[PDB]
């Protein structure tokens, strides 16, 4: 039957707008939706309900057919607390992780009666020559955080014999998605998912070793240019922000005059050393860096160009949990809105993995921008939270700087 | 009339209570008046008379309107209202011609009292109480409530049309080739069949409402096509827009010019040619609404220009799904851009133009991408369908720009197209210093208390400046340095600065501005012949 839950104190339930869809999209939700109607997962709804919470198709994987998405965000964020599965923090280490999509266990438990209404989600009609159809759910909702907490019991419940037919293979649960991560070669690593696969059906592939974070090379020559130096000088500025032990001070000296920008100037053994100084503070990660659990996590994003995407993973300002690149997928070329939900879902999944949690994104894109194209290019299940921003022409200039 | 229709439950917003507000007094003729009504109403099934079990009420007023000059009640419900529920947005979204899938007929319905024919929560109407007086407060007077959605009401726009929907879902599924449109009493009915048919499936829809007690309006009440809706008639072949008349007067006010431009201003959206930039300047300090302001000639003329313009007959094409949507865009001037959505070469659906959207600081191929989006959003939500893309912009162009730009950005499938003036890059900054050219190393500094300061450089080739700057910011002069340094180079020039604002003007190139000053800058960037610029840390 069902379990009572309720919304934070004095939340009240979202009533967010459901952005303008594609004709395309539009006729799936409706088939999909009229689906689920006669199966009693949803029920059509009055006038009288006045939440709402926005939706869309998706195209994961091979499939001609769509996926529903709902975005739960406000809703999750509304809803009450439930103190989940804690972090197995070894999953990060295994050689390969694999995810499953098991949103399709949650329609099997009812929901409660008295929270639905809050679920209310509304299909949209072109040009609006019709109201939306409007409807509300009667199961577990997938993309709803409630689902994979209520649905625990019985999940856990139907992996032990996998758990325990293999322990040397980590399963993590995160909302609709599952990871499995083995050392096993990825033969009998792939093979062994399907048993899994088969398991799980009887009711991505990761390589998270190579991976995390690289360090920042300074530029070397034969001959050096005041260019050369000033762009020099002025990154190790910033970098003093991250690491207080790097010095410019000699290098600064060398710039005293003002000859040509591109004329060469001789270092001075102190710059000289100086320099080698600094290629070995910067030869690793700045210490004392640990990740708080009571704290949000962000992650930030800066678009270097030809493709490429830099990206920092931090809760305290220059102290990195993590830093990464992110080159463009073939068949992007000429779309930055692609490559970057792509990234996003990357960086995510990674944080997930690591963290077992989200990142708040600050992302390089104007709103319009962004919330007039992402859906026609995602594919996860969950949707982290986002803000905008002006990329500081510096951060950039910095992390450009990475080894490849 | 009255309905067998499954109410809707609605509740008073949480923990609050029904209006409770006395009963303006008014005249016996008023009185007389109310009374009438009240037992018309009354026997229609709309309203009961309720006893003194009832603390709610609301204020029942008597006016005369045109149409009789016979008396016509009204409810006062701004407090049954603000203490009502929240409903869900009645549809706020609604159809543009330029989206109708053309019919070969489309007869419009008009549904009448649609609103007094729906039942109300009966759990609810005791909120609707409101009291006929006496002869100026005497005994007590009539007691009523309602039985049906009430005019005025906040959820009667909402429940009406929920209504409505439920009653059109199978006529609807009996015959998906009949597309019907609800919107507040007009439900507009088409369908590619032939008259007869036609004329003989709306009497089927008809007498379906009717089946419900939905009565539709007379034989007389009948609309006619064409149809307007919001300044447009409507034929169901094409649309003409309806045609707008500018008042000529040797009298012009504020309150009038306003008035004016701003029919203008939307006019713009249609017509091809219109200006308004002297009539807005008749407003110029005004000291009051009220206040005539003389028109200057500009004025007059560009008036009377106008005036011809919308003696032109702009028409309509609708949407046939069968063919391309596409879309094109022209740079009227700089941050002002145009553009006509069609199917058919001159066949315009759609026309529209977005005011100069100036910033504090873009490009034009900026400005020409978000034109772009806000366009695609447009046409999603009208058609369901993003256009193919018509800009006056060369392909290398916006590879360079955009291939390389700080932020994320994108312009869905598009082509070329030559109709100058072409949207380009008016300057870009070298890769990398030049060989050759003077290296200015410019510096600004002033107090930003006493808002004086200096401004200059000095250029590897021994030239050098200064100026004195009286009340300025400590940013206007490092611009300035740089500024000078423009002008003073050769065409290639090599500038260094500590200004981490002149980084931003890296970053991003762009040209134009809020502050005459960067914009300046910019004419000058645009003129030389190679720009080089270089940001070091200051101190
Ligand atoms: C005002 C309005 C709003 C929405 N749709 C329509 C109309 N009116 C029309 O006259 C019309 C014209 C052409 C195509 N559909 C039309 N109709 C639809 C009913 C056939």
Same mark, same amino acid.
């Given at each position: 039957?069902?379990?009572?839950?309720?919304?934070?104190?004095?939340?009240?339930?979202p009533?967010?707008?459901?952005?303008?869809?594609?004709?395309?999209?539009?006729?799936?939700?409706?088939?999909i939706c009229?689906?689920?109607?006669?199966?009693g997962?949803?029920?059509?709804?009055?006038?009288?309900?006045?939440?709402?919470t926005?939706?869309?198709?998706?195209?994961?994987?091979?499939?001609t057919?769509?996926?529903?998405?709902?975005?739960?965000?406000?809703?999750?964020?509304?809803?009450?607390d439930?103190?989940?599965?804690?972090?197995?923090?070894?999953?990060?280490?295994?050689?390969?992780?694999?995810?499953?999509?098991?949103?399709?266990?949650?329609?099997?438990?009812?929901?409660?009666?008295?929270?639905?209404?809050?679920?209310?989600?509304?299909?949209?009609?072109?040009?609006?020559?019709?109201?939306?159809?409007?409807?509300?759910?009667?199961?577990?909702?997938?993309?709803?955080?409630?689902?994979?907490?209520?649905?625990?019991?019985?999940?856990?419940?139907?992996?032990?014999?996998?758990?325990?037919?293999?322990?040397?293979?980590?399963?993590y649960?995160?909302?609709?998605?599952?990871?499995?991560?083995?050392?096993?070669?990825?033969?009998?690593?792939?093979?062994?998912i399907?048993?899994?696969?088969?398991?799980?059906?009887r009711?991505?592939?990761?390589?998270?070793?190579?991976?995390?974070?690289?360090?920042?090379?300074?530029?070397?020559?034969?001959?050096?240019?005041?260019?050369?130096?000033?762009?020099?000088?002025?990154?190790?500025?910033?970098?003093?922000?991250?690491?207080?032990?790097?010095?410019?001070?000699?290098?600064?000296?060398?710039?005293?005059?003002?000859?040509?920008?591109?004329?060469?100037?001789?270092?001075?053994?102190?710059?000289?050393?100086?320099?080698?100084?600094n290629?070995?503070?910067?030869?690793?990660?700045?210490?004392?860096?640990?990740?708080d659990?009571?704290?949000?996590?962000?992650?930030?994003?800066?678009?270097?160009?030809?493709?490429?995407?830099?990206?920092?993973?931090?809760?305290?300002?220059?102290?990195?949990?993590?830093?990464?690149?992110?080159?463009?997928?073939?068949?992007?070329?000429?779309?930055?809105?692609?490559?970057?939900?792509?990234?996003?879902?990357?960086?995510?999944?990674?944080?997930?993995?690591?963290?077992?949690?989200?990142?708040?994104?600050?992302?390089?894109?104007?709103?319009?921008?962004?919330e007039?194209?992402?859906?026609?290019?995602?594919?996860?299940?969950?949707?982290?939270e986002?803000?905008?921003?002006?990329?500081?022409?510096?951060?950039?200039?910095?992390?450009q700087?990475?080894?490849? | 009339?009255?309905?067998?229709?499954?109410?809707?439950?609605?509740?008073?917003?949480?923990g609050?209570?029904?209006?409770?507000?006395?009963q303006?007094?008014?005249?016996?003729?008023?009185?007389?008046?109310?009374?009438?009504?009240?037992?018309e109403?009354?026997?229609?099934?709309?309203?009961?008379?309720?006893?003194?079990?009832?603390?709610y009420?609301?204020?029942?007023?008597?006016?005369?309107?045109?149409?009789?000059?016979?008396?016509?009640?009204?409810?006062?419900?701004?407090?049954?209202?603000?203490?009502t529920?929240?409903?869900?947005?009645?549809?706020?979204?609604?159809?543009?011609?330029?989206?109708?899938?053309?019919?070969?007929?489309?007869?419009?319905?008009?549904?009448?009292?649609?609103?007094?024919?729906?039942?109300?929560?009966?759990?609810?109407?005791?909120?609707?109480?409101?009291?006929?007086?006496?002869?100026?407060?005497?005994?007590?007077?009539?007691?009523?409530?309602?039985?049906?959605?009430?005019?005025?009401?906040?959820?009667?726009?909402?429940?009406?049309?929920?209504?409505?929907?439920?009653?059109?879902?199978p006529?609807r599924?009996?015959?998906?080739?009949?597309?019907?449109?609800?919107?507040?009493?007009?439900?507009?009915?088409?369908?590619?069949?032939?008259?007869?048919?036609?004329?003989?499936?709306?009497?089927?829809?008809?007498?379906h409402?009717?089946?419900?007690?939905?009565?539709?309006?007379?034989?007389?009440?009948?609309?006619?096509?064409?149809?307007?809706?919001?300044?447009?008639?409507?034929?169901?072949?094409?649309?003409?827009?309806?045609?707008?008349?500018?008042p000529?007067?040797?009298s012009?006010?504020?309150?009038?010019?306003?008035?004016?431009?701003?029919?203008?201003?939307?006019?713009?959206?249609?017509?091809?040619?219109?200006?308004?930039?002297?009539?807005?300047?008749?407003?110029?300090?005004?000291?009051?609404?009220? !206040?005539? #302001?003389?028109?200057? =000639?500009?004025?007059?003329?560009?008036? $009377?220009? *106008? +005036? @011809?313009?919308?003696?032109?007959p702009?028409?309509?094409?609708?949407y046939?799904?069968?063919?391309?949507?596409?879309?094109?865009?022209?740079?009227?001037?700089?941050?002002?851009?145009?553009?006509?959505?069609?199917?058919?070469?001159?066949?315009?659906?759609?026309?529209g133009?977005?005011?100069?959207?100036?910033?504090?600081?873009?490009?034009?191929?900026?400005?020409l991408?978000?034109?772009?989006?806000?366009?695609?959003?447009?046409?999603?939500?009208?058609?369901?369908?993003?256009?193919?893309?018509?800009?006056?912009?060369?392909?290398?162009?916006?590879?360079?720009?955009?291939?390389?730009?700080?932020?994320?950005?994108?312009?869905?499938?598009?082509?070329?197209?030559?109709?100058?003036?072409?949207?380009?890059?008016?300057?870009?900054?070298?890769? !990398?210093? #030049?060989?050759?050219? =003077?290296?200015?190393?410019?510096?600004? $500094?002033? *107090? +930003? @208390?006493?808002?004086?300061?200096?401004?200059?450089?000095?250029?590897?080739?021994?030239?050098?400046?200064?100026?004195?700057?009286?009340?300025?910011?400590?940013?206007?002069?490092?611009?300035?340095?740089?500024?000078?340094?423009?002008?003073?180079?050769?065409?290639?020039?090599?500038?260094?600065?500590?200004?981490?604002?002149?980084?931003?003007?890296?970053?991003?190139?762009?040209?134009?501005?809020?502050?005459?000053?960067?914009?300046?800058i910019?004419?000058?960037?645009?003129?030389?012949?190679?720009?080089?610029?270089?940001?070091?840390?200051?101190?």
């Open positions: 039957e069902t379990v009572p839950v309720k919304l934070k104190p004095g939340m009240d339930g009533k967010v707008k459901q952005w303008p869809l594609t004709e395309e999209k539009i006729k799936a939700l409706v088939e009229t689906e689920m109607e006669k199966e997962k949803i029920s059509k709804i009055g006038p009288e309900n006045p939440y709402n926005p939706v869309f198709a998706i195209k994961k994987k091979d499939s057919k769509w996926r529903k998405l709902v975005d739960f965000r406000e809703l999750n964020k509304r809803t009450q439930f103190w989940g599965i804690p972090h197995p923090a070894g999953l990060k280490k295994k050689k390969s992780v694999t995810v499953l999509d098991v949103g399709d266990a949650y329609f099997s438990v009812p929901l409660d009666e008295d929270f639905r209404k809050y679920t209310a989600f509304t299909i949209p009609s072109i040009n609006n020559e019709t109201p939306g159809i409007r409807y509300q759910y009667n199961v577990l909702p997938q993309g709803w955080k409630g689902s994979p907490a209520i649905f625990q019991s019985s999940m856990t419940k139907i992996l032990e014999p996998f758990r325990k037919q293999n322990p040397d293979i980590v399963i649960q995160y909302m609709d998605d599952l990871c499995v991560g083995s050392d096993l070669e990825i033969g009998q690593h792939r093979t062994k399907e048993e899994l696969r088969q398991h799980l059906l009711w991505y592939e990761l390589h998270p070793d190579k991976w995390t974070v690289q360090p920042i090379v300074l530029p070397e020559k034969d001959s050096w240019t005041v260019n050369d130096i000033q762009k020099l000088v002025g990154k190790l500025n910033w970098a003093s922000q991250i690491y207080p032990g790097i010095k410019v001070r000699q290098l600064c000296k060398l710039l005293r005059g003002t000859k040509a920008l591109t004329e060469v100037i001789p270092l001075t053994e102190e710059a000289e050393l100086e320099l080698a100084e290629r070995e503070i910067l030869k690793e990660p700045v210490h004392g860096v640990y990740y659990p009571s704290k949000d996590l962000i992650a930030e994003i800066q678009k270097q160009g030809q493709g490429q995407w830099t990206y920092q993973i931090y809760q305290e300002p220059f102290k990195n949990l993590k830093t990464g690149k992110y080159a463009r997928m073939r068949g992007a070329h000429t779309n930055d809105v692609k490559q970057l939900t792509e990234a996003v879902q990357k960086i995510t999944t990674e944080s997930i993995v690591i963290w077992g949690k989200t990142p708040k994104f600050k992302l390089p894109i104007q709103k319009e921008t962004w007039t194209w992402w859906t026609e290019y995602w594919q996860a299940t969950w949707i982290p986002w803000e905008f921003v002006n990329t500081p022409p510096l951060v950039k200039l910095w992390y700087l990475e080894k490849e | 009339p009255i309905s067998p229709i499954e109410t809707v439950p609605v509740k008073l917003k949480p609050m209570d029904g209006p409770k507000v006395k303006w007094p008014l005249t016996e003729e008023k009185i007389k008046a109310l009374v009438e009504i009240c037992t109403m009354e026997k229609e099934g709309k309203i009961s008379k309720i006893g003194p079990e009832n603390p009420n609301t204020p029942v007023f008597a006016i005369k309107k045109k149409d009789s000059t016979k008396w016509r009640k009204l409810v006062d419900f701004r407090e049954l209202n603000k203490r529920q929240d409903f869900w947005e009645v549809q706020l979204g609604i159809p543009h011609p330029a989206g109708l899938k053309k019919k070969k007929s489309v007869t419009v319905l008009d549904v009448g009292d649609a609103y007094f024919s729906v039942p109300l929560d009966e759990d609810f109407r005791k909120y609707t109480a409101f009291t006929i007086p006496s002869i100026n407060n005497e005994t007590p007077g009539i007691r009523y409530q309602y039985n049906v959605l009430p005019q005025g009401w906040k959820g009667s726009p909402a429940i009406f049309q929920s209504s409505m929907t439920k009653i059109l879902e006529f599924k009996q015959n998906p080739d009949i597309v019907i449109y609800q919107y507040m009493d007009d439900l507009c009915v088409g369908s590619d069949l032939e008259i007869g048919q036609h004329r003989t499936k709306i009497e089927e829809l008809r007498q409402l009717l089946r419900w007690g939905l009565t539709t309006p007379d034989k007389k009440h009948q609309k006619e096509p064409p149809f307007l809706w919001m300044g447009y008639e409507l034929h169901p072949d094409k649309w003409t827009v309806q045609p707008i008349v500018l000529e007067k040797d012009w006010t504020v309150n009038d010019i306003q008035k004016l431009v701003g029919k203008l201003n939307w006019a713009s959206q249609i017509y091809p040619g219109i200006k308004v930039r002297q009539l807005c300047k008749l407003l110029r300090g005004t000291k009051a609404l009220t !206040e005539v #302001i003389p028109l200057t =000639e500009e004025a007059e003329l560009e008036l $009377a220009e *106008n +005036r @011809e313009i919308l003696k032109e702009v028409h309509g094409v609708y046939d799904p069968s063919k391309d949507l596409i879309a094109e865009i022209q740079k009227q001037g700089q941050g002002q851009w145009t553009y006509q959505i069609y199917q058919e070469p001159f066949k315009n659906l759609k026309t133009k977005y005011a100069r959207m100036r910033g504090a600081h873009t490009n034009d191929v900026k400005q991408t978000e034109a772009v989006q806000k366009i695609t959003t447009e046409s999603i939500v009208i058609w369901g369908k993003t256009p193919k893309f018509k800009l006056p912009i060369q392909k290398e162009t916006w590879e360079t720009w955009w291939t390389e730009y700080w932020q994320a950005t994108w312009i869905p499938e598009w082509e070329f197209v030559n109709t100058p003036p072409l949207v380009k890059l008016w300057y870009q900054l070298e890769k !990398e210093p #030049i060989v050759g050219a =003077e290296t200015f190393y410019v510096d600004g $500094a002033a *107090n +930003r @208390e006493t808002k004086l300061g200096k401004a200059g450089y000095v250029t590897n080739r021994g030239r050098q400046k200064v100026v004195t700057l009286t009340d300025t910011t400590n940013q206007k002069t490092e611009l300035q340095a740089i500024y000078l340094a423009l002008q003073d180079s050769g065409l290639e020039v090599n500038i260094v600065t500590d200004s981490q604002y002149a980084l931003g003007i890296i970053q991003a190139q762009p040209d134009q501005s809020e502050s005459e000053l960067v914009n300046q910019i004419e000058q960037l645009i003129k030389k012949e190679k720009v080089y610029l270089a940001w070091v840390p200051a101190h």
